[PDB]
Design a protein around this nucleic acid. Structure first.
Ligand SMILES: Nc1nc2c(ncn2[C@H]2C[C@H](O)[C@@H](COP(=O)(O)OP(=O)(O)OP(=O)(O)O)O2)c(=O)[nH]1
Ligand SMILES: *Nc1ccc2c(c1)Cc1ccccc1-2
Ligand SMILES: [Ca+2]
Ligand SMILES: [Ca+2]
Ligand SMILES: [Ca+2]
Length: 341
DNA sequence: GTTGGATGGTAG
DNA sequence: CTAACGCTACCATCCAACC
């Protein structure tokens, strides 16, 4: 059983460079502007040139501009990128039918019935890399391994513009040697709990007792880690099926004023219903981000589909509920539909 | 119990 | 106005419900 993982290089910045070859070689920062002040907002992604200087996803635009003022700042165009994204996701279909599209920029192919061994797998990788390079000018990074988690880890190790195999030998090796905080799904909070426990390596989960580990990092995460370490991890490549559409946005100034807030809430609903496209959701959630970035939400599930009209009235009763039950101002507001028929 | 909803935390 | 864009997926927990 063989899994090939593709993940596009600095994707949005790269699409801008292909849309503007002059930018190539020089720092490019794709950022969302917010409208609260001169350069309010955040960098969504930066090319590798930029990154060398500290400009990366999540930092304030006004900060990035401290560091790199001469650099090129470009407003995000999610729609332009999703189109390139989709063309690429179709080229990959041409190489395997069983494909798990994981994000705007990464997909898992199962290539078991296409290649005989990792050698042929590698070569297919090479071929995929060329094909996406020919037709879309984007460079990707490819990871090949026995399952999804380790094909991802391969890609993480190989990036910019690489291709890397992890054979059943090195899967065994990495279970013993890789920092457990590099295993997909293990972030800062989970890593600091595992260290306290004295678990630094995937193999260490077999030596600790299960109930004690459950106690710390939850059941789901426990099993996942154990399975990885036992070499039993074998979730299949399933087809992407969305469970949530949503859209939440940052207002021009903080407010508690229902009149000031609605136009945001309703532009949120219009885009969500538009993204839904034939999907009927049974549940709606209004989500507020307070003046100090704590996240608060309220919602409702109906026994039937939510019409756009019902979404309106309900989204306002939900927003009110928020303002009633929490007195902080509101910096971002938006909506999330779910539980589709 | 196992299930489902509301809300929230963690991750990518 | 004075820093923090925005997307989806999954799991944990508290807390009725339906036996
Ligand atoms: N707005 C926004 N988009 C993000 C963020 N993180 C990732 N993305 C989007 C934009 C990226 O171009 C796209 C793919 O990002 P990756 O996580 O795969 O890293 P990226 O491809 O941009 O550079 P790569 O060499 O992996 O690191 O996903 C983020 O914090 N904010
Ligand atoms: N707003 C936002 C935050 C994180 C991520 C996206 C959007 C898309 C994406 C893809 C892969 C990893 C992380 C993110
Ligand atoms: Ca990616
Ligand atoms: Ca990427
Ligand atoms: Ca990690």
């Amino acid at each position: 059983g063989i899994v090939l993982f593709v993940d596009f290089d600095y994707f949005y910045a790269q699409v801008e460079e292909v849309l503007n070859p002059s930018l190539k070689g020089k720092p490019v920062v794709v950022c969302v502007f917010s409208g609260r002040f001169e350069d309010s907002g955040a960098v969504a992604t930066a090319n590798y040139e930029a990154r060398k200087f500290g400009v990366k996803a999540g930092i304030p635009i006004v900060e990035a501009k401290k560091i790199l003022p001469n650099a090129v700042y470009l407003p995000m165009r999610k729609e332009v990128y999703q189109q390139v994204s989709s063309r690429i996701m179709n080229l990959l279909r041409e190489y395997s039918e069983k494909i798990e599209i994981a994000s705007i920029d990464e997909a898992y192919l199962d290539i078991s019935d296409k290649v005989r061994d990792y050698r042929e797998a590698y070569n297919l990788g090479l071929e995929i890399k060329n094909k996406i390079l020919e037709k879309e000018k984007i460079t990707v990074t490819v990871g090949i391994s026995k399952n999804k988690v380790f094909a991802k880890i391969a890609a993480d190790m190989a990036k910019p513009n690489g291709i890397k195999v992890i054979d059943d030998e090195e899967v065994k090796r990495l279970i013993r040697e890789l920092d457990i905080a590099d295993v997909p799904g293990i972030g800062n909070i989970t890593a600091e709990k595992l260290k306290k426990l004295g678990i630094n390596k995937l193999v260490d989960t077999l030596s600790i007792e299960f109930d004690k580990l459950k106690g710390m990092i939850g059941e789901a995460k426990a099993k996942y880690l154990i399975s990885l370490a036992r070499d039993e991890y074998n979730e299949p490549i399933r087809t992407r099926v969305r469970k949530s559409i949503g859209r939440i946005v940052t207002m021009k100034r903080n407010s508690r004023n229902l009149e000031e807030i609605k136009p945001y809430l309703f532009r949120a609903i219009e885009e969500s219903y538009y993204k839904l496209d034939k999907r009927i959701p049974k549940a709606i959630h209004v989500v507020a981000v307070t003046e100090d970035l704590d996240i608060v939400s309220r919602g409702r599930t109906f026994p039937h589909g939510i019409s756009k009209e019902t979404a309106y009235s309900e989204s306002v009763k939900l927003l009110q509920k928020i303002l009633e039950e929490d007195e902080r101002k509101i910096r971002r507001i938006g909506v999330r539909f779910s539980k589709f028929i």
